[PDB]
Design a protein around this ligand. Structure first.
Ligand SMILES: *[C@@H]1O[C@H](CO)[C@@H](O[C@@H]2O[C@H](CO)[C@@H](O)[C@H](O)[C@H]2NC(C)=O)[C@H](O)[C@H]1NC(C)=O
Ligand SMILES: *[C@@H]1O[C@H](CO)[C@@H](O[C@@H]2O[C@H](CO)[C@@H](O)[C@H](O)[C@H]2NC(C)=O)[C@H](O)[C@H]1NC(C)=O
Ligand SMILES: *[C@@H]1O[C@H](CO)[C@@H](O[C@@H]2O[C@H](CO)[C@@H](O)[C@H](O)[C@H]2NC(C)=O)[C@H](O)[C@H]1NC(C)=O
Ligand SMILES: *[C@@H]1O[C@H](CO)[C@@H](O[C@@H]2O[C@H](CO)[C@@H](O)[C@H](O)[C@H]2NC(C)=O)[C@H](O)[C@H]1NC(C)=O
Ligand SMILES: CCC(CC)O[C@@H]1C=C(C(=O)O)C[C@H](N)[C@H]1NC(C)=O
Ligand SMILES: CCC(CC)O[C@@H]1C=C(C(=O)O)C[C@H](N)[C@H]1NC(C)=O
Ligand SMILES: CCC(CC)O[C@@H]1C=C(C(=O)O)C[C@H](N)[C@H]1NC(C)=O
Ligand SMILES: CCC(CC)O[C@@H]1C=C(C(=O)O)C[C@H](N)[C@H]1NC(C)=O
Ligand SMILES: *[C@@H]1O[C@H](CO)[C@@H](O)[C@H](O)[C@H]1NC(C)=O
Ligand SMILES: *[C@@H]1O[C@H](CO)[C@@H](O)[C@H](O)[C@H]1NC(C)=O
Ligand SMILES: *[C@@H]1O[C@H](CO)[C@@H](O)[C@H](O)[C@H]1NC(C)=O
Ligand SMILES: *[C@@H]1O[C@H](CO)[C@@H](O)[C@H](O)[C@H]1NC(C)=O
Ligand SMILES: [Ca+2]
Ligand SMILES: [Ca+2]
Ligand SMILES: [Ca+2]
Ligand SMILES: [Ca+2]
Lengths: 390, 390, 390, 390
């Protein structure tokens, strides 16, 4: 007391609804007096008492004089930052956790674990922080580019599970899982199955026995690699999601990849991190996913659901369950997380809405949140409200 | 540790006095360095330990570049925000609770309940949040425009009661009440009586048995619909206030509506949300109300009181208690709320003082507060001090 | 637990030293990005866990557009505000307690009592707040200008004692004391003796039996009225301080008021609020006082001490104990307060250092703090560092 | 509940890695909206629950109008400030602890002790604060310039140990140590041995019996004076570090100082505060140190280590562990500190990275942090990212 936390049955509900928008650049005008941080790759993770809104900053504000380089991914300035969910992530409201150009975090019931990867591309370093204390590291194993989830890690009974990967962006990237306890890496887990390229896994609990993840293959396919990780045996297997509703971007037309479930198909090169979250019921499991409305561009974001079945074997379309972001608006990375009610867990999906005007201006993002709430159908979409000219 | 709260006897006193002004736009000059949020529909709710100042933001600051649209009511950016009462609601001080263009909130003794309506006009959606967790929703039942109080909900023994309404702004809007316990709707209450238009109810406890509300009829009368809700039987009845002192704006001359108490009279179309709060004594009930100084414009705010009687039956004029805002200053929405002293409750009325310069400039509000304190007569009025040209 | 607090023996020490400067206008440049509040009449009060830095704001920031009127004393915008001692009192860091143009506050061991006077000059109103709750008021008794200390009130065993006064600035102003318990006025105390003009009393505990105050006579003398208030009998007597070291400004030459201790003497018109704090030892009492270095202008601030004797009867000079502010710098109001160490109390004097460029610019103040610490002599003076042109 | 803290065994690890950069002036552009404080002499200290980032401010922000004087050391405006480690030290985020132009701080397990020296050069004064209470002072003993560590003090079983010194910058400065318990000085410690110039000691626990410090000789040598302080007997001895790897700046070529360990050698005048921190193992002690990459300029910062031996006697070169700051970036003061994990202590070194544009512009610093974490080799360097023209 505090005790370790475990996944619980989800709170009652049958549809997602628009919850909250964090749009810091609504206050970034030259005519204004604010200092929203320039960020990308936001995610959210919650503990028993609060939710934290994380991102990777370029250590620059709007308005400001350091826009050059903010459309790049890795440099010596990027840091993992957070605010309490609902606060605007400005220079003063934010806290800087560690130097990082790839990140994750999660709460185990007693304390926060923070994860940050930095260093040179060919010998990068994963760093683990438990509360205030730097407690461990893990090294690049392919010497191409070590990296992690860009979303919440997952803790059960004090054991926090985390995807890492290393490899070429356009070739092989075989992922691993780390088992981390009170900030220290106590096991490495080497998945079996379809392992040729797995990155940016969005993971969560299907049950007390099983973690599942929906990931990105940046090289070979528009189907998402789907991880099943058994936390009783510490073993993992990966296969492609068979659904006709391909969740990557870019992607070919739904159902158009012919042959069996493992077939790679066309337009596999490139990709995007995708939302995935679980609705755990007594004898039923809802799997909720998001994908861009556009097949080729990072525009729009749609929500989908399927109950039960085996995602490795089932070609049936996921059920469309609403436009979270219309195709007129940006829809970039998406992620899952869960908010802890008094006796049950609330599944949510967050959406990174990038403000992209190219390399000659600033480059950052808003965060939209949708959560399971009540019944019926999803009723309204999200806009950032930002005019990049101001 | 902690216990559910109940209404208590009011603290001793016999007059209201000027307490506190929150005027964020005193700091919004182009020459300044601050970021007060552009808001409307402020209200206040208190729990056992603190009071919170809530409002509906347009997700824009002064100074800034997003003034266009701030004189409108509903859009995809409006959010329910709060600060601790006494803090200036700026970009950084504020917390964003949820997307909402109509709102409410209340503390039950253990935790905050937050209420926000958003969605499209014909199928809007009321959302309930308990602490950090989104917990329930309620649907549009007239498909016209679902909406709520714009003031505090009211909790007793863990059951929080909330007015909602749905229907045409210039036609029929039959309200209902929701009973919400730990974030979930456990009962609907369908009022009887004079029900054809009730909105923006300002509600409080007359006793442990009864909640009363003074509301707005936007279509048919300048008399306020007056709700009596029995919390023991979970039933409600509504009739017009019979007092000659018509509390709406616009309104005709006092007492000039002829016929029985239910007669509607002249200047019924249009309206304004009105202040109302109870002073609960051992063998006596005081009802305190506010209305604009102008009969037809949102200018000034006067305080009135009457002890005992039946508001449905008594045509007696309310006793004029003093000028809270001069007819030279804006007087828009007003609301009641109660502060928890150690052993008794302090009744207060808040006043929204809108800065209205038309649709070619920014549109926002200050919040003035008067509370029951000491004896004698009300001594001083409130100004916003804001020059909209700066 | 929390229990009521009482004055304790003072911590060991024999000289004051420079502790801390709060100079918010060091960040008020047009070239800067900050919002220090425009204030005057600062004071400090501490409880068992923290110290609060209070002041009276004009509800305006530097830089800003509302400088006009900030060299005035009373208006409908002035408010009592505070920050945690050590924080810069800006728009966002501060909290607004109540509308007030005269103020006081104190902690009783369990909760804060806040005191604010506002209203029209001829019928002003003292308002009492206990925590968040407005709990009582007190009315003007001379209908000239009700006002209070502009420094900490004093609580013992739950009873908080407060000076109020009412009367002409250039004639009679007979003060009273209020005894306030958990926010409610439970006794009025009418002093005897030399009562013709007593205002802006700076008060503290000489012992568990006695509160003493050093006050301002704005009409008749440059000697300070000295209150002795017996908290066992709730009786008070006032006589002039007899010391040759006249503490008011303006003042004639030291010792130059001829005749007995009660003689008024010359240059009595005008005045200033003066610092006074107690050093309580086992069989000895140190009385520490401050006065401007200039006899006629609000420039400089010197510290003085005398041990034992009767301030009503003793003409001996107070011992000069250091320049806190040189005559080159502003020295306006001064006040006493005590910080609570684990087992003993630390006496301190604070100094308002007003930035005065006349009525055509902004008008505000810094706060300097000196406290009893160690042995020897007071070693360094304080400057605000502010160039009013920036 | 709570207990006094003691040094514990260090957490497992064998290399340092880049942890965190605090670079406030990334947000100080004329085009921006922030107010980073102008500071120098940053350090860090941690207690059982949080780490605090301390520095000495010139009481001025960037952008602003008070740059003149910010390249000086001592004045009446300098103050010791802090934020929680990871927050940007701005006007509003920071807390001002006391007036000080030399500083230290440390947590004893129950409460913070804050140390600040101010006053005139010939009779300066060290002030001790415990929590909010000013509790003691210490006087100048050489009347030249009393000063302290500019890094964390060290507490064991409630006794906090602090280096102080006094004397000429280019002549003799014989240091002493103070033993402070709950804010009060309970013992003086007068070192023996090589005492002619010791300042800016960076100190830590070698064990429960022994504190060690690596210090600056500004007059006579580029070898660092090295303190061994026995906390059981409260006595101290000092001798020069014998290592060929001279840690001061300026310095001659490594190993080029001929003669016995106490020989002073070439380029003795001038100096810099140096990083030093212990890695305490069961049967082994690691000593980690930092020095600039340039022999003569404050450019770059390299990390070094040696296990066991006697630093007074061993001429052996320290093992070069990696580049923390490239010779293209500023490397000024460095310091050691330790973070408290649940059951072990994590050693770190911090680096002040001064933005030096000469006396015609602003002068301030970023703070970079490296900590022991994992195994392998140190992988990445730190840049401030600041363009002083913006
Ligand atoms: C997973 O296992 C945990 C731990 O056993 C379950 O949590 C327990 O649930 C039971 C039944 O509600 C309670 O009596 C215990 O107090 C819970 N302990 C906890 C949360 O620490 C949890 O229900 C399981 N999750 C599932 C089935 O999804
Ligand atoms: C409404 O009911 C509540 C609950 O019974 C009353 O609160 C109690 O008041 C009594 C007498 O003052 C106290 O001894 C109890 O401790 C209170 N109980 C709780 C749980 O708070 C309250 O007084 C009633 N209010 C009115 C207006 O009658
Ligand atoms: C004034 O009276 C208070 C209350 O009696 C005294 O505080 C007590 O002091 C004794 C002796 O140190 C302690 O044992 C008690 O625990 C104290 N109780 C408290 C503070 O609540 C205080 O010492 C007296 N002040 C004087 C003599 O200046
Ligand atoms: C220094 O001494 C402290 C105090 O004895 C040691 O802390 C104790 O360590 C033991 C064994 O790990 C624990 O069982 C105790 O609970 C600790 N006591 C306290 C009061 O903390 C510490 O281990 C010693 N450090 C070194 C480096 O030897
Ligand atoms: C090049 C590797 C990887 C997969 C393409 O690039 C990611 C793609 C990104 C993207 O597609 O938007 C942004 C990520 N921040 C980046 N990750 C890292 C660690 O740089
Ligand atoms: C249009 C319905 C209703 C009655 C006219 O409008 C309200 C009136 C308002 C008003 O009269 O000032 C402002 C309210 N924000 C608005 N409410 C909503 C939900 O839009
Ligand atoms: C006119 C009454 C009183 C005594 C002169 O004036 C005070 C003097 C002041 C002064 O001498 O600086 C400032 C005080 N804020 C003012 N008090 C009030 C309540 O207005
Ligand atoms: C003048 C004495 C001392 C040694 C040269 O100067 C220090 C050197 C400094 C330096 O070498 O950068 C900066 C320090 N802030 C300063 N300390 C004080 C107390 O002024
Ligand atoms: C930044 O742009 C400058 C020109 O403005 C160019 O020299 C440099 O290569 C750019 N660097 C990065 C990392 O984009
Ligand atoms: C404000 O927005 C409306 C609706 O889009 C548009 O018609 C109008 O031109 C805008 N006003 C200005 C000043 O741009
Ligand atoms: C403020 O100054 C204006 C002119 O700038 C003048 O009309 C007015 O009287 C002033 N008011 C006060 C209260 O000083
Ligand atoms: C800075 O201050 C010094 C000392 O007062 C003065 O000599 C110099 O002229 C000042 N510099 C500028 C640019 O004003
Ligand atoms: Ca792909
Ligand atoms: Ca009407
Ligand atoms: Ca006088
Ligand atoms: Ca040297």
């Amino acid at each position: 007391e505090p005790e370790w936390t475990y996944p619980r049955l989800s709170c009652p509900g049958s549809t997602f609804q628009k919850a909250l928008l964090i749009s810091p650049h609504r206050f970034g005008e030259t005519k204004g007096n604010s200092a929203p941080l320039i960020i990308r790759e936001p995610f959210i993770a919650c503990g028993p008492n609060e939710c934290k809104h994380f991102a990777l900053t370029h250590y620059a504000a709007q308005p400001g004089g350091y826009y050059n380089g903010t459309r790049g991914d890795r440099n010596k300035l990027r840091h993992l930052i957070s605010v309490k969910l609902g606060k605007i992530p400005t220079v003063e409201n934010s806290i800087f956790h560690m130097a990082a150009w790839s990140g994750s975090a999660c709460h185990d019931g007693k304390e926060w674990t923070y994860i940050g990867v930095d260093g040179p591309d060919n010998d990068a370093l994963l760093k683990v922080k438990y509360g205030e204390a730097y407690t461990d590291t893990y090294h690049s194993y392919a010497n191409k580019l070590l990296r992690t989830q860009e979303s919440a890690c997952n803790c059960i009974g004090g054991n926090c599970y985390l995807m890492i990967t290393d490899g070429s962006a356009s070739g092989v990237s075989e992922c691993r899982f780390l088992k981390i306890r009170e900030g220290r890496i106590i096991k490495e887990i080497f998945p079996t199955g379809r392992v040729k390229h797995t990155e940016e896994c969005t993971c969560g609990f299907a049950s007390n026995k099983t973690i599942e993840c929906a990931c990105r293959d940046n090289s070979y396919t528009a189907k998402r690699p789907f991880v099943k990780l058994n936390v009783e045996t510490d073993t993992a297997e990966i296969r492609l999601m068979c659904t006709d509703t391909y969740l990557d971007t870019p992607r070919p037309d739904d159902g158009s990849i012919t042959g069996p479930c493992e077939s790679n198909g066309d337009k596999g090169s490139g990709g995007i991190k995708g939302g995935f979250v679980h609705q755990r019921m007594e004898s039923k499991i809802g799997r909720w996913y998001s994908r861009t409305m556009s097949k080729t561009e990072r525009m729009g974001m749609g929500l989908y659901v399927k109950y039960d079945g085996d995602p490795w074997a089932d070609s049936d379309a996921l059920a469309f369950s609403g436009v979270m972001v219309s195709m007129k608006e940006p829809g970039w990375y998406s992620f899952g997380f869960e908010i802890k009610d008094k006796e049950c867990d609330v599944p949510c999906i967050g959406i990174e809405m990038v403000h992209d005007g190219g390399k000659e201006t600033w480059h950052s993002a808003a965060t939209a949140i949708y959560c399971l709430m009540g019944s019926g159908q999803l009723l309204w979409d999200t806009v950032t409200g930002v005019d990049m000219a101001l």
